[PDB]
Inverse folding.
C-alpha cells in the first residue's frame, strides 16, 4: 500500500514512457493513470528524472544482484577457467530469463525504454546507472574484452552497441517480429529462443577481423 | 508550392512521427505544424496510414531505385562473379550514403521511424512496402541467402533482423552514441564510419554456426 503506491506509480510511468517516450509523458498524466495524487509522486520520487531512474532500477536491480552473485559463484569454482564469449552471452540471457515477470512483457518493455534512453539522450540516466550498477557492468565488460580478440577500444565500444541494439530492437519489437515469423514461416519462436539465437551471431561478430585499417 | 505543400506536410509528419510515434501524432497536429490546411492533407494523402506510407517512401524511393540500378549494373559486368556478404553489406551502406540529404539527419530519422513501425506493429506499412519495393528487396535478400552458409530459413529470418536492429538502434541513437564516444574516447566517429564498422561484425555473424540443434 506504501509499497503499492510506489508500484502503481512505477507501473503507470513505465507503460506511459514505453508508449509515448519520456519527453511527452507528464507527471500529471502518470498521476492520473496511476490513480494517486501528485503529492505521492512528489514524496516518493520528487522529479521526472528520479522517476525515470526508478523505472530502470526496478528492472536492473534484481538483474544486476543476480548477475553479480553468479559471477562470484562461477569465479569461486576451484577448477574455474576463463569464460568464453558464448559463456558470457549465455550468462546474460540466463540472467534475463531469471528475472521474475511483472507485466509478462518485461524484457520487451525494458528494451523499449532502453532505446528511448538513447534516442532522447537521457544523460542523467547514464550517470545514475553508472553510479548504481557501474561496478558489476564494468566487471562483466572486462570479461567480454578478455574473451574477444584484441580490438581497437573504440571498435569494441561500437561492437558492444551493435550487440545491444540488435537485442534491444528484437525485444522492443518482439510482438511484431513474432507475428511476422508466424505469418511467413508458420512457427511460434519464443522470446528465450530468439535470445539464444543471438548468441552465435554476436560471438562471431565480436571475433570478426577489425574494420579499422 | 504544390510540391512544397506536400514537402511541408511530409516534413512535419516525419518529425512528429519520429518524436512522438504514430499513434500519438494526429493529422491536425501535423497540419498545424506544417502550416497548411487540413484539406491539403486530405487531398494529397487522405489518411494517416497513407501519410505514414508516403513518409517511408520519400526515404526508400530513391534508395531502392538506386540499389536496383546498381545491382543491374554489377550483374551486367562481363566478368561478374558472385557477391560476398561483405560486398552486399557494403552495397547497402554505399547506397544509404548516396541518398541526397534533406534534414542532415536522414538515416537516423528513417531508422527511428523503422523501429517505431515495429514497436507500433504497423502492418499496413509492411503490406505497402512489399507492394512497392518488394521486388528489389527480395532480389537483394536472395543474394544474401546465397552468400551465407546454409541456415534454417527461420534462423536466417532472425539473423537478418539482428542486423537490421543493430543498424536501426545505432542510427536512431547516433547523437547519444557519438556523444558517449566523444566523452569516453575523445574521438568523433562519423555516421559512415559506424556503418562500415557494422560490416565485418554482420558478415561474421551471418556466417556463424547455427544455434538450432
Amino acid at each position: 500500500a506504501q509499497s503499492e503506491t510506489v508500484e502503481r506509480i512505477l507501473d503507470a510511468a513505465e507503460q506511459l514512457f514505453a508508449e509515448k517516450g519520456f519527453a511527452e509523458t507528464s507527471l500529471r498524466l502518470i498521476t492520473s493513470k496511476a490513480g494517486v495524487n501528485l503529492a505521492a509522486v512528489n514524496y516518493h520520487f520528487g522529479s521526472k528524472k528520479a522517476l525515470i531512474q526508478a523505472v530502470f532500477s526496478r528492472f536492473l536491480g534484481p538483474f544486476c544482484a543476480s548477475l553479480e552473485k553468479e559471477l562470484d559463484r562461477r569465479q569461486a569454482k576451484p577448477e574455474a577457467q576463463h569464460a568464453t564469449l558464448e559463456d558470457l552471452l549465455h550468462l546474460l540471457v540466463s540472467q534475463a530469463m531469471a528475472v521474475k515477470p511483472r507485466s509478462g512483457n518485461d524484457l520487451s518493455i525494458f528494451m523499449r525504454l532502453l532505446g528511448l534512453a538513447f534516442s532522447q539522450s537521457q544523460g542523467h540516466l547514464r550517470k545514475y546507472l553508472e553510479e548504481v550498477y557501474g561496478k558489476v557492468f564494468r566487471r562483466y565488460m572486462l570479461l567480454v574484452n578478455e574473451a574477444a580478440p584484441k580490438l581497437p577500444p573504440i571498435e569494441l565500444f561500437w561492437r558492444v552497441h551493435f550487440m545491444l541494439g540488435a537485442a534491444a530492437f528484437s525485444m522492443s519489437g518482439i510482438k511484431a517480429l513474432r507475428a511476422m515469423a508466424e505469418t511467413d514461416f508458420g512457427v511460434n519462436t519464443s522470446t528465450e529462443q530468439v535470445m539464444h539465437l543471438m548468441v552465435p551471431f554476436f560471438a562471431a561478430g565480436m571475433r570478426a577481423e577489425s574494420g579499422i585499417d
About this structure: Chain A has one domain: 1-213.
